[PDB]
């Protein structure tokens, strides 16, 4: 979830809310942005069999029809099996299982009855490197300064040399998927103790563009040496074991690091640095932001830092027990959407113990790179910019789908439009939703060779 947030800020909040059963009730005695956000939280994930009327037409025509006529968002289908997310040129077959986003399971019933009346790995889904050593990636303050890091990803890691191992491999591989061109890859800089990173370097040898800096993320000198003001996303991760002395003291380093960066100034604003922080305790989310009213009994998904995508916790993933039990394909869709694609063959290769194994590029492997990916677009400029001038969400969805084959999932809109540079997440707004020139759209973008 954190890795996907680097490619599209606020994506973790949208994914977390899509798999938690929430009933949405409108309330007038609250802010408009709060009402819009709560409408998105009511959207969940459902599976339904497509009507026989959909047989023959491609996916692009099928999902457009559901959005307009049926008011349902179709993003993935099951092909005889495999799950494909927004496939282009994929004709709908008989008894095809469709994946929908809707308020409740009653809404998706309308989709059943309806009529007229070595450069890569072995699987070829991740970029590969010839097993670079750790010492070749360790950077010092003097040599990290001369290196120009623009649009990179900074991983702030708090970990003792004997801290339990965390899956830093699970954070880098989604950023190293073959669906991204090599020139568009994002450099990864890990700020932390190499005595801990050394234990986890075995799984990171074959991943390109990884940098290591010995130090502490709480130090302003280290942060300035990696250009935190120019990074695309800053991740504050803590691998230290909680002392259990006090729950409010479990996230001292994580909160301090967030506040430290937020107050930094550069020769430009520390508050403009995009950060996402994972919290050991749910109750510590109150200290992440200052311009809000904190209530200890409020649910985590209702808090402002979570709604803006700057906070995360493992306590939002309990509902995956119920989601997986009622539908195994639901869990497969999530894994194929956040891990960059992890086929069951990749499971056995990694379980052997030899690490990631590369493979020679051939005709069958290069076809695997043609799949949709998670990204964000802005209505500031471009052919789609004219929809931001007080346009409609439905108009933008249809035009983007037909031209560029883009599927709009939600909006990432400024909290206040009259200020603070804070944006919240709206999941699946109605087709009559009014757009703004400053709005950002979560999209599923096809792979363009070249």
């Amino acid at each position: 979830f954190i890795a996907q947030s680097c490619l599209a800020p606020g994506f973790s909040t949208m994914m977390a809310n899509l798999f938690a059963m929430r009933s949405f009730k409108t309330s007038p005695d609250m802010q408009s942005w709060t009402n819009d956000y709560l409408r998105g939280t009511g959207m969940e994930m459902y599976t339904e069999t497509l009507s026989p009327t959909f047989i023959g037409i491609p996916f692009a025509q099928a999902t457009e029809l559901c959005f307009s006529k049926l008011k349902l968002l179709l993003l993935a289908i099951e092909i005889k099996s495999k799950i494909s997310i927004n496939p282009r040129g994929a004709k709908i077959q008989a008894n095809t299982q469709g994946f929908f986003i809707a308020q409740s399971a009653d809404e998706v019933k309308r989709a059943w009855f309806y009529c007229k009346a070595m450069k890569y790995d072995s699987t070829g889904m991740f970029h590969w490197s010839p097993a670079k050593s750790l010492e070749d990636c360790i950077l010092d303050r003097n040599q990290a300064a001369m290196t120009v890091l623009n649009g990179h990803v900074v991983v702030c890691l708090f970990a003792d040399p004997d801290s339990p191992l965390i899956g830093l491999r699970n954070l880098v591989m989604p950023l190293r998927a073959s669906n991204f061109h090599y020139h568009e890859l994002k450099h990864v800089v890990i700020v932390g103790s190499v005595d801990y990173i050394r234990r986890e370097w075995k799984m990171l040898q074959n991943l390109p563009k990884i940098s290591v800096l010995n130090g502490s993320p709480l130090s302003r000198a280290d942060l300035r040496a990696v250009n935190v003001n120019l990074c695309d996303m800053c991740c504050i991760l803590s691998a230290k074991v909680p002392s259990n002395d006090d729950p409010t003291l479990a996230d001292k380093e994580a909160i301090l690091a967030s506040l430290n960066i937020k107050a930094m100034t550069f020769d430009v604003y520390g508050a403009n640095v995009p950060m996402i922080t994972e919290l050991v305790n749910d109750g510590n989310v109150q200290f992440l932001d200052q311009d809000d009213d904190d209530d200890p009994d409020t649910e985590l998904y209702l808090t402002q830092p979570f709604a803006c995508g700057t906070a995360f916790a493992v306590s939002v993933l309990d509902s995956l027990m119920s989601t997986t039990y009622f539908n195994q394909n639901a869990l497969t869709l999530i894994r194929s959407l956040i891990t960059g694609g992890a086929t069951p063959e990749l499971e056995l290769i990694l379980a052997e113990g030899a690490g990631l194994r590369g493979g020679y590029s051939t005709v069958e492997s290069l076809s695997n790179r043609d799949r949709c990916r998670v990204g964000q677009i802005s209505l500031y400029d471009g052919p789609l910019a004219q929809f931001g001038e007080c346009g409609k969400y439905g108009d933008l969805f249809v035009a983007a789908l037909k031209s560029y084959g883009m599927l709009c999932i939600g909006l990432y809109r400024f909290r206040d439009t009259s200020a603070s540079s804070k944006r919240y997440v709206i999941t699946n707004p109605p087709d009559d939703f009014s757009l703004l020139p400053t709005d950002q759209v979560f999209v599923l973008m096809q792979f363009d060779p070249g």
Partner: protein
Amino acid sequence: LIGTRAKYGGTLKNEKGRRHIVVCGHITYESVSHFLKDFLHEDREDVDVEVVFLHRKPPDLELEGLFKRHFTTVEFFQGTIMNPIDLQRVKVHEADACLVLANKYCQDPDAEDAANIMRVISIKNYSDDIRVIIQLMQYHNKAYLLNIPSWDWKQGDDVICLAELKLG
């Protein structure tokens, strides 16, 4: 089941016009008596300022008697700074300043400083415009407080580092 009691509680409600301060952190018998003797002294200029104490532990018999002898000036409430509910009870947003007392005789000064710093974060989270005076055991932990966006020495925020002052 029967061996339980909730003695201290309730919100601070008084008249308007007078001013008060909130004291938290290390609240013991000698921590309060030493503080009150210097705070309420004859040589000091006579100003009516109320002292409010907020600690998560129930005071013992000796501490309760000390509060009784200062009934018209000192009041005690049971709670913690980290809880926003308890902050509203003692009316932090209207207090002149919040004083955080440190445990000087602590086995781990690093642990004591970290807990005290988190209290300032909680106080500043509730209200950005509040004076905070805090004791710090080590000088290198002063950098964390200065990095807080709401910390401002020009507005009355002060750090009294015992290590810096003792060796000075």
